[PDB]
Design an enzyme around this catalytic site. Sequence first.
Site, PDB file in Angstrom:
ATOM      1  N   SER A  61       0.777  -1.226   0.000  1.00  0.00           N
ATOM      2  CA  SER A  61       0.000   0.000   0.000  1.00  0.00           C
ATOM      3  C   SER A  61       0.827   1.305   0.000  1.00  0.00           C
ATOM      4  O   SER A  61       0.239   2.418  -0.137  1.00  0.00           O
ATOM      5  CB  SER A  61      -0.949   0.022   1.187  1.00  0.00           C
ATOM      6  N   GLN A 117     -11.068  -4.755  -0.215  1.00  0.00           N
ATOM      7  CA  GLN A 117     -10.534  -5.573  -1.296  1.00  0.00           C
ATOM      8  C   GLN A 117     -11.513  -5.623  -2.448  1.00  0.00           C
ATOM      9  O   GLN A 117     -12.721  -5.795  -2.263  1.00  0.00           O
ATOM     10  CB  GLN A 117     -10.286  -7.009  -0.797  1.00  0.00           C
ATOM     11  N   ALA A 308       1.782  -3.178   2.963  1.00  0.00           N
ATOM     12  CA  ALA A 308       2.132  -4.574   3.084  1.00  0.00           C
ATOM     13  C   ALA A 308       1.628  -5.343   1.891  1.00  0.00           C
ATOM     14  O   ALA A 308       0.679  -4.923   1.232  1.00  0.00           O
ATOM     15  CB  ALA A 308       1.576  -5.155   4.353  1.00  0.00           C
TER      16      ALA A 308
END
EC number: 3.5.2.6
Length: 351
Positions: A61, A117, A308
């Site tokens: 990110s 997501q 991450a």
Amino acid sequence: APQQINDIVHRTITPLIEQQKIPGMAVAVIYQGKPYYFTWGYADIAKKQPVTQQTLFELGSVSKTFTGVLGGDAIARGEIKLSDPTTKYWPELTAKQWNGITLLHLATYTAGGLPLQVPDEVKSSSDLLRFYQNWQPAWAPGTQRLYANSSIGLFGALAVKPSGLSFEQAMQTRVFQPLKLNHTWINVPPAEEKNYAWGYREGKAVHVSPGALDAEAYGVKSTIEDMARWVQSNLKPLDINEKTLQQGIQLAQSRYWQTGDMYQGLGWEMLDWPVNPDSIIALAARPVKAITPPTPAVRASWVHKTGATGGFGSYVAFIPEKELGIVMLANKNYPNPARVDAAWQILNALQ
Ligand SMILES: O[C@]1(c2ccccc2)CCN[C@H]2CCCC[C@@H]21
């Protein structure tokens, strides 16, 4: 390196690596325009390849900072406006819940609860349209912040539409190239695979999987050198010769919304410096206050972003007023607070 920088970095990072069982790590400290580099351990354990200043790490990110600046550049080019309705750039988005949702909402996770997501099953442009058409907001736009790849990812995709370029072509030509980030990639070329670290998740070597809006939300890979250059470019945007890029950087650090002690930029997040280090969960819904109009980039800020992927954990932070920045790239996804603690320990000591 000046011994002070050597000492604070080694004394902070060595214990961090031991406690978190991090296989390989690179760290840059940038102090008054000069970068200082540090590396430890393994890019590839099995093949015994060390981490070097040329190792590529998945930024996860942290990529959103690139997307936010590319979007700022497009605003500066007069191609888009953050006040534009989403539908202006995607008129096929006809469902009524999109009325009132602007590019600013998408860019800042304030559209009304877009999900973290994009679902794995969503592959094509027609799948994506169906996904956004069917999504039902929990909240009115501009009322709550919920961090989301589906939100800033869409922003990135729409922001490059007027340019005519693919997202990746726009990023290369408008951001990577002018800033001389020549080992920063949305797709790692075969020639560069020798430098691409493996991530480690539960002991297994892994790389990020393809997914829709991956480029826009979490798909950049980069070296410690290019990331240090990236931080410096964001630290001191006025040195940048390309007018729209200089301006886009400035726009990405403007303060659009406030939740608690944090201000949301485009990709970047900011707190007033000096910060309580304590002030710096799968889903966290927070009411936001609009900053009307957005405050331009504040020099006395702790500006940062964590990132991450399954096998990587990255962090960048800088403080314009102190001419100080830091990049930490690791090929394990270890807890965010340990990243911030380490970064704060290092920057506070040098500040
Ligand atoms: O400050 C520099 C740098 C290079 C690499 C990492 C961090 C900072 C060095 C001198 N030129 C500047 C040119 C503009 C970008 C930043 C650099």
